[PDB]
Design an enzyme around this catalytic site. Structure first.
Site, PDB file in Angstrom:
ATOM      1  CG  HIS A   1      -1.776  -1.260   1.320  1.00  0.00           C
ATOM      2  ND1 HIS A   1      -2.828  -1.566   0.491  1.00  0.00           N
ATOM      3  CD2 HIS A   1      -1.644  -2.315   2.156  1.00  0.00           C
ATOM      4  CE1 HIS A   1      -3.315  -2.757   0.807  1.00  0.00           C
ATOM      5  NE2 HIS A   1      -2.610  -3.237   1.820  1.00  0.00           N
TER       6      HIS A   1
ATOM      7  CB  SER B   1      -4.468  -6.308   0.179  1.00  0.00           C
ATOM      8  OG  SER B   1      -4.050  -7.376   1.042  1.00  0.00           O
TER       9      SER B   1
ATOM     10  CB  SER C   1      -6.899  -0.093  -1.319  1.00  0.00           C
ATOM     11  OG  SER C   1      -7.251   1.034  -0.571  1.00  0.00           O
TER      12      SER C   1
ATOM     13  CG  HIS D   1      -3.731   0.652  -3.778  1.00  0.00           C
ATOM     14  ND1 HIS D   1      -4.083   1.712  -2.971  1.00  0.00           N
ATOM     15  CD2 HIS D   1      -3.350  -0.343  -2.940  1.00  0.00           C
ATOM     16  CE1 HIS D   1      -3.898   1.387  -1.707  1.00  0.00           C
ATOM     17  NE2 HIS D   1      -3.447   0.149  -1.665  1.00  0.00           N
TER      18      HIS D   1
ATOM     19  NE  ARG E   1      -4.318 -14.100   1.019  1.00  0.00           N
ATOM     20  CZ  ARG E   1      -4.873 -13.658  -0.096  1.00  0.00           C
ATOM     21  NH1 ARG E   1      -4.944 -12.349  -0.348  1.00  0.00           N
ATOM     22  NH2 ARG E   1      -5.352 -14.553  -0.960  1.00  0.00           N
ATOM     23  NE  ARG E   2     -10.680 -12.614   8.695  1.00  0.00           N
ATOM     24  CZ  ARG E   2     -10.780 -12.825   9.996  1.00  0.00           C
ATOM     25  NH1 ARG E   2      -9.813 -12.413  10.838  1.00  0.00           N
ATOM     26  NH2 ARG E   2     -11.882 -13.479  10.431  1.00  0.00           N
TER      27      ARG E   2
END
Ligand SMILES: O=C(O)c1ccc(NC(=O)c2cccc(CC3CCCCC3)n2)c(Nc2ccccc2)c1
Length: 190
Positions: free
Chosen positions: A42, A110, A112, A130, A138-139
């Protein structure tokens, strides 16, 4: 020019440490076939590529992207072929070291999003900002796959159907990679 594919965690990037959205909170705003930047963790100054599509499928939200930054590809390729540090957490003697290094070191995708407060109403501007390649946070299950052709990449995911992959790939192939703007990544080595 590498492709990346996988399932995303949807995150808001908030004073909070982290908010993980349920996919059903954003599926009304999919698919997205216009390019979003792909960055590392990010960070806005670490653009390495561009998304090719974001799609709701049965087992989550799937992202396909292109890794296009010359500075990044040159750096990651050199480390894959010459760095014992970059190779330490990967299996010995891989056939495609760059792909294995990215799969190991940047396993998490991921997406956003804006905050759910706006998602339930009627957002005025873009819902997504993005996609990031991530080494932490990480889930959900599955990890990112990197490869030289999008078909091979998407077909590595058993949880994506034959018809889901065809839908995903219908757009990916229609995208011309060289006409994508150069991402802003600079090698840390200067
Ligand atoms: O400027 C610095 O001091 C600095 C220090 C550490 C850095 N990166 C790390 O600590 C780090 C951890 C996990 C994942 C990655 C990205 C991955 C890219 C391809 C090969 C292996 C690494 N970087 C980075 N960022 C970076 C490093 C290598 C490639 C791309 C970005 C910068």
């Amino acid at each position: 020019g590498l492709y990346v594919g996988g399932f995303v965690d949807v995150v808001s990037c908030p004073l909070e440490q982290e908010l993980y959205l349920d996919p059903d909170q954003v599926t009304d705003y999919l698919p997205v076939t216009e390019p979003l930047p792909i960055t590392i963790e990010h960070l806005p100054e670490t653009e390495v590529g561009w998304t090719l599509g974001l799609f709701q499928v049965s087992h989550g939200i799937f992202c396909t992207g292109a890794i296009t930054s010359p500075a990044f590809l040159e750096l990651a390729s050199r480390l894959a072929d010459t760095s014992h540090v970059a190779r330490a957490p990967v299996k010995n003697l891989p056939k495609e070291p760059l792909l294995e290094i990215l799969h190991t070191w940047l396993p998490g995708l991921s997406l956003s999003s804006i905050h759910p407060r706006e998602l339930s109403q009627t957002p005025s501007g873009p819902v997504f900002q993005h996609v990031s390649l991530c080494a932490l946070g990480r889930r959900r299950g599955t990890v990112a796959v990197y490869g030289h052709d999008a078909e091979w990449v998407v077909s590595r995911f058993s949880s994506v159907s034959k018809s889901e992959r065809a839908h995903i790939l219908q757009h990916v192939s229609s995208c011309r990679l060289e006409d994508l703007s150069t991402p802003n990544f600079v090698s840390p080595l200067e």
